[PDB]
Symmetry: C3
Subunit: 203 residues, 3 copies
Amino acid sequence: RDVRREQQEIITRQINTAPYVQDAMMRVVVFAQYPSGRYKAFDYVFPDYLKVFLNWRELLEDDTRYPMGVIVSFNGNIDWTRARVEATNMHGLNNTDWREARAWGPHVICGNQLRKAGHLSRAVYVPLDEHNTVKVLATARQNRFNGPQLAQTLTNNIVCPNVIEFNTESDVIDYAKMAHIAYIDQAGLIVASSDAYISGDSQ
Amino acid sequence: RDVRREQQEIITRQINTAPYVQDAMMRVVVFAQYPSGRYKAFDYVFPDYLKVFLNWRELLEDDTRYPMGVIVSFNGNIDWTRARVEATNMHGLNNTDWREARAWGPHVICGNQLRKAGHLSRAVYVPLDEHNTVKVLATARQNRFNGPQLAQTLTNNIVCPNVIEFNTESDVIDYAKMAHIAYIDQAGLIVASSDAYISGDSQ
Amino acid sequence: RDVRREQQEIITRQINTAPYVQDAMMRVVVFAQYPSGRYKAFDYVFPDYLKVFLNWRELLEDDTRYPMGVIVSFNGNIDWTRARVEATNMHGLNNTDWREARAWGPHVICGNQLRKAGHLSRAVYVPLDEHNTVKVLATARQNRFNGPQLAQTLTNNIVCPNVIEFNTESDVIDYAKMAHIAYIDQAGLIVASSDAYISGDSQ
């Protein structure tokens, strides 16, 4: 008899399920934390796959200009068995001698290193030293990579990056909440998530 | 008996047909019109496919700094049934809530919204509001996306972008004419085209 | 009986062979030589393929600001029958009229124009005039482009570019030596290589 409630339930379910449709968007954000207490976010929206290399220059606030670390926030129907992050050297290498470097290092960040922030989101904190660059891979969960489809996947995958500066963690946090993306605050708490709740945190 | 004329005819036909060869170049230009009367062109040449995201910063003249709109000029052997443009928000999303956004919106600009500017060219005017970004997709008309070929298509597709500033529409127009690309002037007229004519506009 | 020597031999062989493993890194560097005697290097590390377009702006030192030419240094398990360089115009075209331009020009730089600098490295010097841009293609030697694999190749290919300024050729040379990449000095000599020697140049 409560169709108003049922409709609101389906709307909530729709929001939570819409990201699993084949042409849905995914969202990966790299939050960089600076000694000054400021943050910079590298915010990517994309439908199929995301390959990211952040060089040392882009990572500078613009070394107390260099981030103490990053929070990497993965959101959407992402293949969690392949999602990964690694901190490479200033050349983007995972071995100082390129001749023994590889696409990914033997200790790449993946698996349970990515903390669950809801069904749609995972987040990981990665400390950085002044000589680090950052690599991230995120792919849509299967298969759009197979056969004929790959061509449509390649041509339709327009990655839309934005860089956003925040004066304080409060701005970062409110941003994550209104953007519906995972974020871990300075105390280690999951303070934002992609998951829609019909009542919010009412328990 | 007029082989001089016949040769000139074949040269004209060669120019008009050369873009249909499998490794020919295509050219897509995004002309941004500013309140000041100045323009900025994002000029891309590419052989296989073009995926473009123009963020709000790139769109600024450098808000009366923000474009009133863009003319998107598509040129070459482009798949016209898939060529498309859309104006997304500042994040590159076609829904404010990313969880319900998709690679393309339900109202994407395509079909007869692209005005014929000759056999080789189509052009469309898209008005913009201060919070808009621009996405463009253009692919070569079929199949180089199929099977073994896809690899060569991926590896050979080097997109060559140039940004060009113009003080006035006259400079924009003369540029389009000498570049052989479609352009629509402020009065709505097609003033440039990719099509070569043996006598010019002699009728 | 000299296992210390044998171990060092295998280490040397390992260094020389490691680049031929399927997920090994490759390294392509474009060294730009300026009239001032300064250089700028565009240094790319990547595991599968590299498509590069350097526009006229990026080529400026920042016209005596424009390079006299570039040394292109290719390093790794690169498909040498497809490695190529070409100098295009300011639009990235190999014909002034785009309608008759192609992905590559009829005179592209390849084959024995690339000088052998060891088994792992080739290098070529390309003179430039003020109106030139630079294109480079390098692909991993086969097949990771075939069938199912192509998807992993596409998603794993994160190109990591760095731009590096050098005050003098000496800095360029020491860089190449410590980076283990091919470089040709001002006198035409191969002064750096990717090849590891157990004794260095002891002959």
